[PDB]
RNA sequence: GGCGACUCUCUGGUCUGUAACUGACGCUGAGGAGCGAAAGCGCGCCGUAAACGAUGAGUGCUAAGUGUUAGGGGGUUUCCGCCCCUUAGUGCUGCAGCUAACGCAUUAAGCACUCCGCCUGGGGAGU
RNA sequence: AAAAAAA
């Protein structure tokens, strides 16, 4: 029994040893007797006993000494408490105490010595270290004392006001918005201090609410003045030289199909059918690469920027308005250049044959979502009498995304087809609606263009042997996935396989089975939030929700930074034919870093864009105060439960607010549970609403029952 | 929200009909609710005796 | 006298020699007791929801008809007895 | 030399057991939490439930199961992790039935 | 009182619509007869039951608002769907009135007529 | 809260 324990120690004191499941430790030790295993377990224990050993909420064994510790990122939460979320991801969540963050502040890197006991469910710790600082600059609102100032956090996990001294005050008034850079941190008793760095303007000015938002995520400004020189100086017409060595498709019908209100036409489309049955489509894309030459002064911005962000009252764009509307811009009967990706595809929807190849093209038509859902669906015949040379290519169109789609989801791809709002402002940025956003067929009939195009590419690519980027979806959380796979077996949705080896498909299936079902948002959304995000990457490592094994972002260059990227690629390898060892080397060195920050601009991206729309939905239901609306029961918690409205708005139900009953939460089948009465509230539920609270600042929403 | 008997006319519910009574049971197997279908009364009594006969007769079961 | 459906299920392991004297025999019982077989499915060996009789396929015949109490029930009485008729069920054609 | 079988999971608040027979319910193997030395509030556990399913299936594996039927009984909170643990010992569940008295 | 697996066998009632027929043939109903828990117990007697929605039956009259169950008609509507009106039942809310107040309020505890049951301080004593 | 994708 010692010598085992000895003989697993040592093995955990490896220095390449990383924090392993029982399961795992089997694996690697090769125990493959019953007997050897009961051993193990025995062994585990008597080590954990004795403190040698740490056992993770996550069921992960590492040896605590080596660290006594945890390294990780703090997660703060705005009551004062945290949680490290630990580098190794498959570690659980270490619970931080408000007395023990020792000055930490949310995102800082720290390292946090672990209790030997818990109070709790999860497992506690103490910052020991704080290796990293993540938080310089802070916005938030401005407040004047008598001899100082005081800026209120609009990041409400951090918990404490920033003190502004009298002479870094800078300007900035009473209820002014503020940038603020730390100058000190907090220590002991003392509040972290600062100097105002920038004011916005008054807190009541209309869009310094999005504005303010902007500056927390750190969003990019204006253009630099070289690029805005760069920009300006770009021709507005094609020069004919560039005619040169690009295919003349100028007297083809091709079509742009967008928003109404899309200025930045980044791609527009071509079907043919051919006489044996089989599709030709073509796909011609805005050559950005072209104007946008590698270390320009708009490349190294749109590096920085990484990605347009799409806010509720603005486009903040990844290029100069002049070329992303302008000359890179599919613009309607005007020659444009494209790099295009023309493609066979037989009634199986099997790409037989395709071409990569610079062009030039001159649009026949742009075309919006609803003109074409209008001739598809609704049969209009004004529209098709208006655009009736199209209106065979249409349809033609309609059937060919079918068959790709069919293809796509017989492949096994995840169609997680929810709600999404669209918040309609007025000129001034108040808000006047919040609707659903509905894929029509328009827009699905692109999709499908865009993707099969996107998975040519980076097959060619992956072929080509050439450094490349793509776009990756990581197989997901196995611990994540096995809960929601506990999960959708309460509501009797029983799954084909095991949380490790997954298939899309069977996922597929249970999106299929909850459809027109009062379960399907939340089984919907409980899935979602098992899947990793999806990143890019130099390695082609598949995308899980597409069921693919090559993917990448071709068809965006205008708004996307790793697709203008691709087009550079494109035009090195295949056009210029430079696939010299040097060529390789250079970009080998460099995508990492690429792929790496531009994954990180999305992400702020969407999480800006999500948390201006949460702003501007508070702000929608502050004049519904005391109005009943139905809504559905979308997650539950110890404290409450959220009920989303059919306008995609959530709120909260704090079960103060439940009065009838002391409702005690249960974990395992997601529902609060009525002691007396036994009135069970469950996630998917349908219940009937009032609007009781509503904090814009806080982007709160709070609702009381009125009924089942 | 909307009955299928009384969306698609249709009067008589069979038993036999095994494929239009499987909409109507839990995958597990047991009988729907009116408030989850959207049914009508009238209709959701009807069903639920088909499927009755149905589970009866092994066309569909009791417990899957 | 009035319609009356029945169905029931025969033992998924004879053959078709077998099979058809089966149909024919309670094809005989019916109109020998003064029924009148209007219509005759057959719905071929399905795979039964649940176990019955340690099977787990059968034979599935539709008899539709018209009759007294008398036929119908003298067909369930043999229905009940004979090994080769597993499950049955009549019902009556509601109006 | 049987390939198909139903794995019976009797999970109680105290305990889970994991039975697993042929078709005709001859017993191939069982584990229980408290046969792998678990006791007092960690047979009632689910990673207890998890291990117990595990050894039962192990067992199976060396007579030579594939697929598997599952039987449950019992209130207990081990049925879903057991289950999981019976998918990930390699044997395919073909359908889960709560057969509670 | 009560009645929830399914099918068949026999059988009771109710509601809607038509208005073809009969032509007041109706209502209540002591006694009587039958049905009718625990129990009591010896399946049978027993039969007493917050067998008390604490509220006999019948008929007519007397604001509204809203839900459900089974129907009828018209409107659009192809129909589905909606809209409206009507019938029967079951709900909530609320006038007039009633009420000691509480409450009831076309499912009256309102306004009436018919007939029946029942009460006339508590205890003693359901002896 | 939390996914693609689109924009």
């Given at each position: 029994?010692?010598?085992?324990?000895?003989?697993?120690?040592?093995?955990?004191?490896?220095?390449?040893?990383?924090?392993?499941?029982?399961?795992?430790?089997?694996?690697?030790?090769?125990?493959?007797?019953?007997?050897?295993?009961?051993?193990?377990?025995?062994?585990?224990?008597?080590?954990?006993?004795?403190?040698?050993?740490?056992?993770?909420?996550?069921?992960?064994?590492?040896?605590?000494?080596?660290?006594?510790?945890?390294?990780?990122?703090?997660?703060?939460?705005?009551?004062?408490?945290?949680?490290?979320?630990?580098?190794?991801?498959?570690?659980?969540?270490?619970?931080?105490?408000?007395?023990?963050?020792?000055?930490?502040?949310?995102?800082?890197?720290?390292?946090?010595?672990?209790?030997?006991?818990?109070?709790?469910?999860?497992?506690?710790?103490?910052?020991?270290?704080?290796?990293?600082?993540?938080?310089?600059?802070?916005?938030?609102?401005?407040?004047?004392?008598?001899?100082?100032?005081?800026?209120?956090?609009?990041?409400?996990?951090?918990?404490?006001?920033?003190?502004?001294?009298?002479?870094?005050?800078?300007?900035?008034?009473?209820?002014?918005?503020?940038?603020?850079?730390?100058?000190?941190?907090?220590?002991?008793?003392?509040?972290?201090?600062?100097?105002?760095?920038?004011?916005?303007?008054?807190?009541?000015?209309?869009?310094?609410?999005?504005?303010?938002?902007?500056?927390?995520?750190?969003?990019?400004?204006?253009?630099?003045?070289?690029?805005?020189?760069?920009?300006?100086?770009?021709?507005?017409?094609?020069?004919?030289?560039?005619?040169?060595?690009?295919?003349?498709?100028?007297?083809?019908?091709?079509?742009?199909?967008?928003?109404?209100?899309?200025?930045?036409?980044?791609?527009?489309?071509?079907?043919?059918?051919?006489?044996?049955?089989?599709?030709?489509?073509?796909?011609?894309?805005?050559?950005?690469?072209?104007?946008?030459?590698?270390?320009?002064?708009?490349?190294?911005?749109?590096?920085?920027?990484?990605?347009?962000?799409?806010?509720?009252?603005?486009?903040?764009?990844?290029?100069?308005?002049?070329?992303?509307?302008?000359?890179?811009?599919?613009?309607?009967?005007?020659?444009?250049?494209?790099?295009?990706?023309?493609?066979?595809?037989?009634?199986?929807?099997?790409?037989?044959?395709?071409?990569?190849?610079?062009?030039?093209?001159?649009?026949?038509?742009?075309?919006?979502?609803?003109?074409?859902?209008?001739?598809?669906?609704?049969?209009?015949?004004?529209?098709?009498?208006?655009?009736?040379?199209?209106?065979?290519?249409?349809?033609?169109?309609?059937?060919?995304?079918?068959?790709?789609?069919?293809?796509?989801?017989?492949?096994?791809?995840?169609?997680?087809?929810?709600?999404?709002?669209?918040?309609?402002?007025?000129?001034?940025?108040?808000?006047?609606?919040?609707?659903?956003?509905?894929?029509?067929?328009?827009?699905?009939?692109?999709?499908?263009?865009?993707?099969?195009?996107?998975?040519?590419?980076?097959?060619?690519?992956?072929?080509?042997?050439?450094?490349?980027?793509?776009?990756?979806?990581?197989?997901?959380?196995?611990?994540?996935?096995?809960?929601?796979?506990?999960?959708?077996?309460?509501?009797?949705?029983?799954?084909?396989?095991?949380?490790?080896?997954?298939?899309?498909?069977?996922?597929?299936?249970?999106?299929?089975?909850?459809?027109?079902?009062?379960?399907?948002?939340?089984?919907?959304?409980?899935?979602?939030?098992?899947?990793?995000?999806?990143?890019?990457?130099?390695?082609?490592?598949?995308?899980?929700?597409?069921?693919?094994?090559?993917?990448?972002?071709?068809?965006?260059?205008?708004?996307?930074?790793?697709?203008?990227?691709?087009?550079?690629?494109?035009?090195?390898?295949?056009?210029?034919?430079?696939?010299?060892?040097?060529?390789?080397?250079?970009?080998?060195?460099?995508?990492?870093?690429?792929?790496?920050?531009?994954?990180?601009?999305?992400?702020?991206?969407?999480?800006?864009?999500?948390?201006?729309?949460?702003?501007?939905?508070?702000?929608?239901?502050?004049?519904?105060?005391?109005?009943?609306?139905?809504?559905?029961?979308?997650?539950?918690?110890?404290?409450?439960?959220?009920?989303?409205?059919?306008?995609?708005?959530?709120?909260?139900?704090?079960?103060?607010?439940?009065?009838?009953?002391?409702?005690?939460?249960?974990?395992?089948?997601?529902?609060?549970?009525?002691?007396?009465?036994?009135?069970?509230?469950?996630?998917?539920?349908?219940?009937?609403?009032?609007?009781?609270?509503?904090?814009?600042?806080?982007?709160?929403?709070?609702?009381?029952?009125?009924?089942? | 929200?909307?009955?299928?008997?009384?969306?698609?006319?249709?009067?008589?519910?069979?038993?036999?009909?095994?494929?239009?009574?499987?909409?109507?049971?839990?995958?597990?197997?047991?009988?729907?609710?009116?408030?989850?279908?959207?049914?009508?009364?009238?209709?959701?009594?009807?069903?639920?005796?088909?499927?009755?006969?149905?589970?009866?007769?092994?066309?569909?079961?009791?417990?899957? | 006298?009035?319609?009356?459906?029945?169905?029931?299920?025969?033992?998924?392991?004879?053959?078709?020699?077998?099979?058809?004297?089966?149909?024919?025999?309670?094809?005989?019982?019916?109109?020998?007791?003064?029924?009148?077989?209007?219509?005759?499915?057959?719905?071929?060996?399905?795979?039964?929801?649940?176990?019955?009789?340690?099977?787990?396929?059968?034979?599935?015949?539709?008899?539709?008809?018209?009759?007294?109490?008398?036929?119908?029930?003298?067909?369930?009485?043999?229905?009940?007895?004979?090994?080769?008729?597993?499950?049955?069920?009549?019902?009556?054609?509601?109006? | 030399?049987?390939?198909?079988?139903?794995?019976?999971?009797?999970?109680?608040?105290?305990?889970?057991?994991?039975?697993?027979?042929?078709?005709?319910?001859?017993?191939?193997?069982?584990?229980?939490?408290?046969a792998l030395g678990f006791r007092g509030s960690r047979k009632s556990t689910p990673f207890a439930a998890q291990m117990a399913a595990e050894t039962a299936a192990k067992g199976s594996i060396e007579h030579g199961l594939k697929t598997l039927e599952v039987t449950v009984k019992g209130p207990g909170s081990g049925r879903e992790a057991a289950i999981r643990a019976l998918q990930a010992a390699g044997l395919e569940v073909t359908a889960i039935r709560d057969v509670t008295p």
């Amino acid at each position: 029994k010692e010598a085992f324990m000895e003989k697993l120690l040592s093995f955990m004191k490896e220095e390449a040893y990383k924090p392993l499941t029982v399961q795992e430790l089997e694996e690697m030790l090769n125990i493959t007797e019953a007997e050897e295993f009961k051993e193990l377990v025995k062994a585990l224990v008597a080590l954990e006993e004795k403190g040698l050993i740490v056992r993770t909420r996550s069921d992960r064994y590492g040896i605590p000494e080596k660290m006594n510790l945890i390294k990780g990122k703090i997660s703060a939460h705005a009551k004062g408490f945290a949680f490290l979320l630990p580098e190794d991801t498959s570690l659980s969540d270490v619970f931080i105490p408000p007395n023990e963050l020792n000055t930490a502040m949310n995102g800082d890197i720290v390292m946090v010595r672990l209790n030997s006991q818990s109070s709790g469910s999860r497992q506690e710790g103490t910052v020991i270290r704080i290796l990293e600082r993540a938080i310089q600059r802070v916005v938030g609102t401005y407040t004047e004392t008598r001899n100082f100032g005081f800026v209120i956090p609009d990041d409400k996990k951090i918990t404490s006001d920033i003190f502004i001294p009298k002479n870094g005050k800078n300007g900035a008034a009473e209820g002014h918005k503020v940038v603020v850079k730390l100058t000190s941190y907090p220590e002991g008793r003392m509040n972290a201090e600062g100097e105002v760095e920038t004011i916005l303007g008054h807190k009541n000015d209309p869009g310094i609410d999005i504005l303010s938002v902007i500056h927390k995520h750190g969003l990019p400004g204006e253009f630099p003045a070289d690029a805005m020189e760069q920009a300006s100086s770009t021709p507005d017409t094609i020069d004919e030289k560039d005619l040169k060595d690009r295919r003349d498709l100028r007297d083809q019908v091709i079509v742009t199909i967008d928003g109404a209100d899309a200025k930045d036409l980044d791609d527009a489309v071509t079907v043919t059918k051919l006489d044996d049955g089989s599709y030709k489509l073509g796909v011609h894309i805005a050559d950005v690469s072209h104007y946008v030459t590698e270390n320009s002064p708009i490349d190294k911005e749109a590096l920085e920027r990484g990605t347009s962000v799409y806010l509720v009252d603005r486009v903040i764009p990844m290029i100069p308005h002049r070329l992303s509307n302008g000359i890179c811009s599919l613009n309607p009967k005007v020659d444009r250049l494209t790099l295009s990706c023309e493609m066979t595809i037989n009634s199986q929807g099997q790409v037989t044959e395709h071409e990569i190849f610079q062009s030039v093209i001159k649009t026949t038509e742009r075309m919006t979502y609803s003109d074409v859902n209008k001739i598809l669906v609704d049969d209009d015949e004004e529209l098709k009498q208006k655009y009736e040379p199209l209106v065979p290519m249409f349809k033609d169109m309609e059937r060919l995304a079918q068959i790709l789609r069919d293809k796509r989801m017989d492949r096994g791809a995840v169609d997680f087809d929810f709600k999404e709002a669209k918040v309609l402002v007025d000129d001034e940025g108040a808000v006047k609606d919040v609707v659903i956003r509905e894929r029509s067929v328009a827009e699905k009939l692109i999709e499908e263009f865009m993707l099969v195009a996107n998975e040519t590419v980076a097959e060619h690519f992956h072929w080509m042997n050439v450094p490349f980027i793509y776009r990756i979806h990581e197989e997901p959380n196995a611990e994540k996935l096995q809960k929601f796979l506990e999960f959708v077996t309460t509501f009797g949705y029983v799954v084909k396989g095991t949380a490790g080896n997954i298939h899309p498909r069977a996922l597929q299936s249970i999106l299929d089975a909850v459809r027109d079902r009062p379960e399907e948002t939340v089984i919907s959304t409980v899935m979602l939030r098992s899947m990793k995000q999806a990143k890019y990457d130099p390695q082609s490592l598949g995308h899980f929700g597409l069921s693919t094994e090559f993917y990448t972002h071709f068809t965006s260059p205008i708004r996307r930074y790793p697709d203008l990227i691709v087009h550079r690629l494109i035009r090195t390898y295949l056009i210029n034919g430079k696939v010299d060892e040097a060529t390789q080397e250079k970009w080998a060195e460099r995508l990492p870093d690429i792929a790496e920050h531009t994954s990180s601009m999305e992400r702020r991206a969407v999480d800006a864009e999500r948390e201006t729309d949460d702003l501007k939905k508070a702000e929608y239901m502050l004049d519904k105060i005391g109005e009943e609306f139905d809504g559905m029961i979308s997650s539950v918690t110890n404290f409450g439960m959220f009920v989303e409205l059919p306008n995609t708005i959530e709120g909260l139900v704090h079960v103060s607010f439940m009065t009838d009953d002391y409702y005690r939460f249960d974990e395992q089948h997601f529902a609060m549970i009525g002691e007396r009465t036994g009135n069970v509230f469950r996630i998917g539920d349908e219940i009937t609403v009032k609007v009781v609270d509503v904090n814009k600042d806080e982007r709160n929403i709070d609702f009381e029952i009125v009924g089942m | 929200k909307v009955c299928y008997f009384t969306s698609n006319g249709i009067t008589h519910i069979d038993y036999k009909d095994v494929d239009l009574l499987k909409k109507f049971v839990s995958e597990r197997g047991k009988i729907l609710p009116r408030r989850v279908t959207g049914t009508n009364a009238k209709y959701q009594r009807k069903l639920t005796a088909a499927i009755k006969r149905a589970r009866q007769m092994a066309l569909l079961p009791y417990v899957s | 006298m009035r319609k009356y459906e029945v169905m029931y299920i025969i033992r998924p392991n004879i053959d078709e020699e077998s099979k058809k004297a089966v149909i024919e025999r309670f094809n005989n019982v019916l109109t020998s007791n003064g029924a009148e077989i209007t219509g005759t499915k057959d719905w071929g060996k399905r795979r039964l929801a649940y176990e019955i009789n340690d099977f787990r396929d059968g034979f599935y015949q539709i008899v539709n008809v018209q009759s007294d109490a008398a036929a119908v029930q003298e067909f369930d009485r043999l229905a009940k007895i004979s090994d080769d008729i597993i499950r049955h069920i009549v019902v009556k054609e509601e109006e | 030399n049987i390939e198909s079988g139903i794995a019976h999971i009797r999970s109680t608040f105290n305990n889970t057991i994991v039975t697993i027979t042929d078709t005709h319910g001859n017993a191939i193997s069982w584990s229980s939490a408290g046969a792998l030395g678990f006791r007092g509030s960690r047979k009632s556990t689910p990673f207890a439930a998890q291990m117990a399913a595990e050894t039962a299936a192990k067992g199976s594996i060396e007579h030579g199961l594939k697929t598997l039927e599952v039987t449950v009984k019992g209130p207990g909170s081990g049925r879903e992790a057991a289950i999981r643990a019976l998918q990930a010992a390699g044997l395919e569940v073909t359908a889960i039935r709560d057969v509670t008295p």
